[PDB]
Amino acid sequence: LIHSIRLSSVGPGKATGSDVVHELSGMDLAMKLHYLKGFYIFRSHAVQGLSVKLIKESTFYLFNNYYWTCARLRRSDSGRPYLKCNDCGARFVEAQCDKTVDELLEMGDYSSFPNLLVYHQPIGPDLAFSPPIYLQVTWFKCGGMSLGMSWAHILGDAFSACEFINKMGQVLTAIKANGPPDPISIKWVDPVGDHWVTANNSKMDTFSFHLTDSRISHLQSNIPVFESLCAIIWQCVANNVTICKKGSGNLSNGQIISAFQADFSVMEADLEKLAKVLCYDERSRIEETMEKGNGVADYIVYGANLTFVNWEDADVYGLELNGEKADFASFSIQGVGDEGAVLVLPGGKGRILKIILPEDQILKLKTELKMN
Amino acid sequence: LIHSIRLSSVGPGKATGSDVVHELSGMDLAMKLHYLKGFYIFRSHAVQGLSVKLIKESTFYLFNNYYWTCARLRRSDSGRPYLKCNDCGARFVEAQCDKTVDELLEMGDYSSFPNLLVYHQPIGPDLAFSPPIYLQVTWFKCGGMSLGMSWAHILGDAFSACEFINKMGQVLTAIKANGPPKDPISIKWVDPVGDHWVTANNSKMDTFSFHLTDSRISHLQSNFIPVFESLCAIIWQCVANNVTICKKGNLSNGQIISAFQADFSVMEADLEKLAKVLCYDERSRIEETMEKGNGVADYIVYGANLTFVNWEDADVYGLELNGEKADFASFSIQGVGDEGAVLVLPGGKGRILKIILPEDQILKLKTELKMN
Amino acid sequence: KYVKLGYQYLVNHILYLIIFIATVYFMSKPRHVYLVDYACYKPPVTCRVPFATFMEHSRLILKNNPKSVEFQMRILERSGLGEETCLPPAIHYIPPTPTMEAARGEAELVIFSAMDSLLQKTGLKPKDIDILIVNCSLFSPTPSLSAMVINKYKLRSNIKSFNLSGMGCSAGLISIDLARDLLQVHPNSNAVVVSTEIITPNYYQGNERAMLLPNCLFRMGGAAILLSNRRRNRSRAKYRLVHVVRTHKGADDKAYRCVFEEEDKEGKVGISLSKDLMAIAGEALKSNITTIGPLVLPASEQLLFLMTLPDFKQAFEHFCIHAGGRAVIDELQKNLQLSAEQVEASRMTLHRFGNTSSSSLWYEMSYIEEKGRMKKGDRVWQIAFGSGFKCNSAVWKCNKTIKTTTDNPWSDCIDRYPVHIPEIVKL
Amino acid sequence: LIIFIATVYFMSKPRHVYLVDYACYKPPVTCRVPFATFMEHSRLILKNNPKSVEFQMRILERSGLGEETCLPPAIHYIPPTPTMEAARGEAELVIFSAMDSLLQKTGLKPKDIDILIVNCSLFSPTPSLSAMVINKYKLRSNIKSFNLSGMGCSAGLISIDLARDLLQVHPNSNAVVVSTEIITPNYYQGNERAMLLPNCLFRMGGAAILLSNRRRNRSRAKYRLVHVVRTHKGADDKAYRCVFEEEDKEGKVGISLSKDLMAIAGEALKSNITTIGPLVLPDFKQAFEHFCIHAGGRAVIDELQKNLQLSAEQVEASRMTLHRFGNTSSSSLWYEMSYIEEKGRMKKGDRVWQIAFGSGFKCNSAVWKCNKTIKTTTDNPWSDCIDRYPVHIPEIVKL
Ligand SMILES: CCCCCCCCCCCCCCCC
Ligand SMILES: CCCCCCCCCCCC
């Protein structure tokens, strides 16, 4: 499917100076085992006039503002990791696809897109030589182009990654036009050393589906859209529950994390019960927990307690090449604990729900939704 | 055993000139399905200070006298083959052997030596691009050297090939010293082969070599100049009608070839009787039948009947490098007919007997001969 | 021996009714050769190669040869290179795949950029170029690089074009000397000298430690120089060529083989460096200095030397030591007792642009010019060295005080570049 | 009044440049490659490309090459395996043989060589070939050495012109010019037809020439250089790209020739003649006794003979050099010269016009004058075949 893969490096066009570092906060360290995969697919009309040279130049000018995303991980004497800004760069991948964009979008099974259009390698087992950003550009027969990013969650959250990609697009356009410029939401896991990967007892699988405005309104028979959908999926999955929404340019993990522990029967509960539960910030607790460990202990956020993620506010379609939005853009989490996760993404009139569980639970959920 | 094989071409140092040809007689055409494989093995002492460059130079100066051995086969208007002396050359092969000369000379039977130390390809299926001579030089780990030659029988007989190799050695030494200078019964008609001159056998021909000493010769003679005659009689009795004898009579097919049809049963015949019938030339009739076919018909000499070849007088140990004869030299025929052949070679005071027969008959003879 | 060469040349140099005495001199004097101007190529920031990226790519490429990676780390830690040195695009891929298309692209980019800058600076018309000399050591396509320039700029059919290849990093001064002679022969003519090293074919794809140092040190760069003997250029010329001294230690077997292109055990071509490269370099530099001493030293120093049978800081105002290695600059500074400010241009050029083979002298000249330190009448000594172990030297005299400009390779970094270069760069 | 009219002329007079002698490399018979062997090796190598073999057959049939041209040892193996070691060995062999012959026949001491110019188009090791010569013969440290590379088959006359200028600058000096083409790295290992023609024609050869401006060589010199004219057609895109080194679809490097190549050559030649007509003419062929046309192709010799109305005797040296040695690149002109000297046809005062052409389509020519009647010798590459060599060359050589 994908052939002619070429690797190289990009990075800041301006040296940042020696001795520059970048501290990782408690939230950054609590997300060190998670990654973001985001891919955009454009047709030949939008990518007209673009070549790998232009994209590389735009990335070189983009990383001047995000030089720390090209840094490498070191460990202090106390063992707390940090980013040393040596301008090592981000990994750049060029790929070819024998299919066309029209053919690729006419498959229905988009579940393989994150694995083929995005190049991902975990940080480690040697921290000092693991880039936190992988960018892949794939060229199709019809002339369309795919842009995939693997983004280490230490750098920031999904909104930060979307801002980064939008800035890349803006810089490309500018170059073309004007010339060069105790908490519950986290779970302690067995130490992973320098290999930052989420360990899973079972084989996790992802299943995604789109819901329209009519479906959401009908399900809402009992702001409220996200809560109601979370309640529906929570009831079908059926104690600990985690929610993860947007907070209130700069790259940061500015995401509101909350958790609730329910000593009641979720299995047999009214929908309004779970809705009131969900709609009625744990940054401080996580910060203190990670500070008391000097950043050496390892925790996972996603998949800790059936995480719910609200990316309907994410600018997943903010990348405009030649003033045209991507034909199809999507985002997902790489690395999710056993409890799995649910992701809400901004579709059209409705929302796109991605659900990550063990395969047997995936089949059970598909059976449960076969009539609901 | 043999690795690092490199092919090349050698030939006359002086241009032969345009329109030069070389005619093939009736004997040459009758011999065209047979080839001679010879090889010589020298220890590291004899070939000291002898590189491939020197051997190639000596061959370049040798082929001036034998330019027609570098010719290529053509067919005239009537279809009679001849040799166009276009100086296309002879094939040269360079090979390496991990073993040493001592290991090779102390590993039992030398049955695979002709196959590995001699590079052989038949003439055809395209006559115009088939060299009649292949030379191969093998270098051993100890520093010893093997020289093998595959020689088309159209060029001459075993004595001619031995003279050619001895002249090669003489030229090499001189360059080192003074710098550069009625129906015939012996031949059987065979199915047409067109341009692929190979002897076709409806069986698996196999060889069997042994070293009858100067003592057992008299021991077998007492059972009843004609030494090879008595050996041929013994082998004829052991393998038991039609018999062929080849014996010694500038390169030419000068062999004296005779045949003797028999009516008395060979099995129940005295050894002296068979010796008498054996010891008591068919070139004229062979040439006449060849001319009656316009040189287009195909005939087989060796293996047409039970063939006995007398090479005891051939100068097998004639090649001298730095004044030292080959540690081990041997000659044999490739392309023997179904009937088989029995070659007698010199072993100093003794004889070496190479029998070529169908494998089952070889197994039978292995036991039949041991009784005497 | 080399003192004898210097004095032999000086005998034929100090030499340079009324009508006869005037004519016997005016018709035998050498023509003045003038460096009208020159342009240095400024590699784009998209080609920069920081230390960490180089070492990561080495770790990924030589994954099965840890000792080679360690050797490259040791070499590049003490090289004195900075974070802004550049390599051509083809070498940025994790396995580099050097093709002749990429080599031609890099050659066109560098050479055409330099030539465009030169023509814009001097107002020179292509039809006025009489001589063209191009020197690049390794890259040599069948239609010459000089032929490529002639095609690009449509030079005259009677252009005297020359392509010097395989002559190492000292061949820039060989080109300068050739232009000097050709301008002696041909009056009222212009010569253009292009000095460059295309890195894409120069890159070594094996893992032998003797062949990996050029990968660590050589970086992108190029220069185009306009020389003239026209009387009109005499006023606006930046420099006047005073001397060129050539030394060839190729007769000695050790010097001949100290930098040798050859295949390794795996059949990959690269430049092997000998263990005694430093001894050969010291001897060649000493021989060149001894030969040139008689031509530039004050008569006082020469008489002092002769009596006890000197100080070159008094013979020159500016020094341009080829940036072929930190150790060579160290040793020259130690032996000649040069101050930190007298080797500042060479060290800064090595830090900023790395080892640009034959064009580094012009980056050093640009560095001196952009600090406003090149005054009228100043004397500049350029010295270069390279394979065959040729060692060449040139002496220039500033013809007019040089005002700082903005179309130079140092324009965007000169305000800070007298920087501290640590002995060991920690990764 | 006499001084200002006499010394002005005497001081503005160019120095006389003399061809003291030259030596041509004689390839050994062990490197000989007849037509049949070339075609058989081509069949074995390009076994999967019958059309490439047919193209090479068609090219070599009408090439005008004989049976005694030579290729270096590395090219004799059925699949050639060119290595840098083999290229260095061939370069050393050819160049050292020619240099030894030159130093033996001139009596020139290596310490008396002031200028050394080496031109070889494709081969260019990091220690230049001039450095190799300096190391071999232990030349002076202040020698003016130059290595011209990538300038094609006309670069021999470029080397001659450079030596002429350097001898103008430097009085009482000797220049040695080594013109050669190493075939081992030149060989094309692919099967693209446009890049296969060079393999069919380029053969081993080399030349070492001693030039001087010393008065002691004014009487024993063979020739005096009269003129050198250079033409460059690189400004025209078609002429620039008509001989271009590049990779094929399989990534193998070779030299592609354009279909219009012949046309371009014609134009270049014409230009050169139009530039040298006013320098020698008082009808082009009546200004010269002898002609040396670079043996870069039978068709080019045919075209020049037709245009300049040359006779069979006047183009004899070029045709015989093409037949005997093939296309030896820049050294070709010196084999042809030797031919005229070996027939006893080079008399004092005779004018020789050499012309060469190559990549970028530079086209250069040189006019020499004979300084002394040259007697036949036995230390030249034609010695063992001159007595028969004015041979009949068939339009098509039948395999
Ligand atoms: C600031 C990021 C720059 C991204 C470009 C990096 C290019 C690296 C050049 C190739 C390094 C080769 C290392 C030696 C391998 C043997
Ligand atoms: C007489 C035979 C001498 C060896 C000829 C070798 C031919 C090599 C060149 C072929 C190139 C395809």
**Site of tokens 């698996």:** B204
Question: Which chain A residues are within 8 Å of C83, Cβ to Cβ?
Answer: 15, 87
| Residue whose C-alpha is closest to residue D334's, from D360, D368, D309 | D368
Note whether C45 and C158 are same-domain residues: yes
Mutate to test the interface with C, among D115, D129, D139, D149 (most CBs of C within 10 A): D149
Question: Which chain C residues are within 8 Å of A56, Cβ to Cβ?
Answer: 46
Query: Are residues B86 and D29, on separate chains, in Cβ contact within 8 Å?
Result: no
Q: Which two tokens stand for residue D115?
A: 């200028």
Helix (H) or strand (E) holding B152: strand B145-152
Burial of C108 (0-12, 13-18, 19+ CB in 10 A): middle
Residue C350 zone, left/alpha/beta (φ > 0; ψ -120 to 50; rest): alpha
DSSP-derived letter for residue B324 is: E
User: Do A and D have ≥3 inter-chain CB pairs under 8 A?
Assistant: no
Residue D394 lies in a domain: no
Q: In what order do the strands lie in the sheet with B90-97?
A: B2-10, B90-97, B133-140, B145-152, B35-42, B328-334
Residue C427 lies in a domain: no
Total domain count, chain D: 2
- Which structural domains are found in chain B, ordered by start? 2-178 (3.30.559.10), 188-371 (3.30.559.10)
Residue A234 contacts residue A306 (beta carbons within 8 Å): yes
Residue of C46, C59, C83 lying closest to A57 (CB–CB): C46
Could you tell me whether strands A241-246 and A307-310 are parallel, antiparallel, or unpaired per DSSP bridges?
parallel
- What distance in Å separates residue D375's CA from the closest CA in chain C? 35
Identify the experimental approach.
cryo-EM
DSSP, collapsed to helix, strand or coil, labels residue D231 as: strand
Query: Are residues B13 and D30, on separate chains, in Cβ contact within 8 Å?
Result: yes
Report which protein residue has its CA nearest ligand 1's atom 9: C92
Alpha-carbon B92 to chain mean position:
18
Give the whole-angstrom CA distance, residue C144 versus residue D148: 10
Residue D196 zone, left/alpha/beta (φ > 0; ψ -120 to 50; rest): alpha
Note whether C221 and C312 are same-domain residues: no
Q: Which two tokens stand for residue B112?
A: 């695979």
Catalytic residue (choose from C86, C318, C320, C399)? C318
Q: Is D186 a catalytic residue?
A: no
Tell me the resolution in Å.
2.4
Burial of C37 (0-12, 13-18, 19+ CB in 10 A): buried
Residue C18 lies in a domain: no
Question: Which chain C residues are within 8 Å of A87, Cβ to Cβ?
Answer: 50, 52-53, 83
Mutate to test the interface with C, among D11, D116, D126 (most CBs of C within 10 A): D126
Residue D99 contacts residue D178 (beta carbons within 8 Å): yes
Give the whole-angstrom CA distance, residue C144 versus residue D358: 11
Mutate to test the interface with D, among C142, C213, C283 (most CBs of D within 10 A): C142
Catalytic residue (choose from C229, C351, C398, C399)? C351
B contact chains, 3+ CB pairs < 8 A:
D
Note whether D147 and D277 are same-domain residues: no
Torsion angle defined by CA atoms of residues D310, D314, D317 and D318, in that order, rounded to the nearest 10 degrees: -10
Q: Is C243 a catalytic residue?
A: no
Give the whole-angstrom CA distance, residue C163 versus residue D359: 13
Question: Which chain D residues are within 8 Å of B6, Cβ to Cβ?
Answer: 77
Give the whole-angstrom CA distance, residue A282 versus residue A270: 27
Reported in sequence order, the residue ranges of chain A that DSSP labels E, i.e. its strands, are 2-10, 21-22, 35-42, 72-75, 81-84, 90-97, 133-140, 145-152, 187-188, 204-211, 241-246, 255-260, 299-300, 307-310, 328-334, 341-346, 351-358
Residue B174 contacts residue B181 (beta carbons within 8 Å): yes
Note whether C226 and C283 are same-domain residues: no
Q: Is D232 a catalytic residue?
A: yes
Note whether C294 and C201 are same-domain residues: no
To test the ligand 2 pocket, which listed residue (D60, D71, D90) has its Cβ within 8 A of the most ligand atoms? D71
Give the whole-angstrom CA distance, residue D157 versus residue D164: 10
CATH of the domain at C249: 3.40.47.10
Task: Compute the count of residue pairs across chains C and D with CB atoms less than 8 Å apart.
Answer: 213
Whether ligand 1 lies within 6 angstroms of the CB of C209 is answered as no
End-to-end CA distance of chain C: 47
Whether ligand 1 lies within 6 angstroms of the CB of C49 is answered as yes
Which A-chain residues 104-143 have CB contacts (< 8 A) with chain C? 129
Could you write out the DSSP letters of every residue in A288-332?
A: HHHHHTTT-S-EE-TTSSSEEEE-TTS-TT--BSSS-B-SEEEEE
Contacts of D207 (CB under 8 A, 6+ apart): D22, D23, D24, D25, D98, D156, D177, D178, D179, D180, D330, D331, D334, D335
Q: Which two tokens stand for residue C387?
A: 């394979």
Q: Is D290 a catalytic residue?
A: yes
Note whether D204 and D314 are same-domain residues: no
- Alpha-carbon Rg for chain B, nearest whole angstrom, is 21
CA of D39, closest atom in ligand 2:
12
Residue D67 lies in a domain: yes
Note whether C52 and C69 are same-domain residues: yes
Question: Which chain A residues are within 8 Å of C45, Cβ to Cβ?
Answer: 13-14, 60
Q: Is C32 a catalytic residue?
A: no
CA separation (Å) from C72 to A346, C421, D265? 50, 19, 50
Task: Compute the count of residue pairs across chains B and D with CB atoms less than 8 Å apart.
Answer: 49
Residue of D135, D143, D169 lying closest to C256 (CB–CB): D135
Residue C17 lies in a domain: no
Which D-chain residues 32-71 have CB contacts (< 8 A) with chain B? 32, 34-37, 40-41, 43-44, 66-68
Q: Which two tokens stand for residue D351?
A: 């004018």
Q: How far is the CA of C22 from the centre of ligand 2 (A)?
A: 68
Q: Which residues line ligand 2 (CB under 6 A)?
A: B 9-11, 87, 89; D 32-34, 37-38, 41-42, 71, 75-76
Give the whole-angstrom CA distance, residue C341 versus residue C348: 11
- What distance in Å separates residue A135's CA from the closest CA in chain C? 14
Q: Which two tokens stand for residue B157?
A: 């007989």
Which residue type occupies A250? N
Angle between helix D2-12 and helix C18-26 axes, rounded to 10 deg: 10
Q: How far is the CA of D53 from the centre of ligand 2 (A)?
A: 15
Could you write out the DSSP letters of every residue in A25-37?
A: -HHHHHTTT-EEE
Note whether C73 and C208 are same-domain residues: yes
Residue D321 lies in a domain: yes
Alpha-carbon C283 to chain mean position:
19
| Residue whose C-alpha is closest to residue A133's, from A112, A160, A152, A147 | A152
End-to-end CA distance of chain D: 76
SS3 percent helix, strand, coil of chain D, rounded to 5, is 45, 20, 40
User: Do B and A have ≥3 inter-chain CB pairs under 8 A?
Assistant: no
User: Do D and C have ≥3 inter-chain CB pairs under 8 A?
Assistant: yes
Residue B165 contacts residue B319 (beta carbons within 8 Å): yes
Query: Are residues D141 and C263, on separate chains, in Cβ contact within 8 Å?
Result: no
* HSE of A1, CA atoms in CB hemisphere, 13 A: 8
Helix (H) or strand (E) holding B151: strand B145-152
Q: Which of C235, C259, C284 is the last residue of a domain?
A: C235
Give the whole-angstrom CA distance, residue C121 versus residue C118: 5
Query: Are residues A6 and C46, on separate chains, in Cβ contact within 8 Å?
Result: no
Could you write out the DSSP letters of every residue in D195-222?
A: HHHHHHHB---EEEEEEE--GGGTTT-S
Report which protein residue has its CA nearest ligand 1's atom 11: C54
Give the whole-angstrom CA distance, residue B133 versus residue B153: 10
Note whether D114 and D22 are same-domain residues: yes
Note whether C108 and C251 are same-domain residues: no
Query: Are residues D30 and B60, on separate chains, in Cβ contact within 8 Å?
Result: yes
**Site of tokens 């055990």:** C265
Residue A6 contacts residue C93 (beta carbons within 8 Å): yes
DSSP, collapsed to helix, strand or coil, labels residue C51 as: helix
Q: Is C355 a catalytic residue?
A: yes
Q: Which of D192, D217, D242 is the last residue of a domain?
A: D217
| Residue whose C-alpha is closest to residue C381's, from C423, C342, C424 | C342
Provide the 10 A C-beta neighbour count for residue C409: 25
Residue D389 lies in a domain: no
Q: How far is the CA of D35 from the centre of ligand 2 (A)?
A: 8
Q: Which long-range contacts (CB under 8 A, 24 or more apart) does D378-381 make?
A: D379/D23, D379/D101, D379/D105, D380/D24, D380/D338, D380/D341, D380/D342, D381/D24, D381/D25, D381/D26, D381/D325, D381/D335, D381/D338
Note whether D212 and D231 are same-domain residues: no
Residue C22 lies in a domain: no
| Residue whose C-alpha is closest to residue A31's, from A162, A155, A189 | A155
Contacts of B330 (CB under 8 A, 6+ apart): B38, B39, B110, B113, B114, B316, B345, B352
CA separation (Å) from C201 to B324, C95, C205, C306, D122? 52, 14, 10, 49, 14
Note whether D118 and D236 are same-domain residues: no
Contacts of B7 (CB under 8 A, 6+ apart): B91, B92, B93, D44, D77, D78, D79
Alpha-carbon B8 to chain mean position:
23
Residue of A8, A53, A72 lying closest to C94 (CB–CB): A8
Give the whole-angstrom CA distance, residue C142 versus residue B106: 57
Q: Which residue of A has its CA nearest to C58?
A: A129
Q: How far is the CA of B92 from the centre of ligand 2 (A)?
A: 11
Report which protein residue has its CA nearest ligand 1's atom 16: C58
Burial of A180-196, coded b for 16+ CB within 10 Å and e otherwise, reads eeebbbbbeeeebeeeb
Phi, psi of C262 (to 5 degrees): -170, 170
- Range of C355's domain? 243-398
Residue A300 contacts residue A189 (beta carbons within 8 Å): yes
Q: Which two tokens stand for residue D146?
A: 């130059």
Burial of D114-142, coded b for 16+ CB within 10 Å and e otherwise, reads bbbbbbbbbbbbbbbbbbbbbbbbebbbe
Query: Are residues C45 and A8, on separate chains, in Cβ contact within 8 Å?
Result: no
Could you tell me whether strands B90-97 and B2-10 are parallel, antiparallel, or unpaired per DSSP bridges?
antiparallel
Provide the 10 A C-beta neighbour count for residue A367: 9
Reported in sequence order, the residue ranges of chain D that DSSP labels E, i.e. its strands, are 18-24, 115-119, 144-148, 174-180, 206-212, 223-232, 243-247, 253-257, 290-293, 351-357, 362-370
Residue A168 zone, left/alpha/beta (φ > 0; ψ -120 to 50; rest): alpha
Residue A100 zone, left/alpha/beta (φ > 0; ψ -120 to 50; rest): beta
Residue A19 contacts residue A155 (beta carbons within 8 Å): no
Give the whole-angstrom CA distance, residue A151 versus residue A120: 8
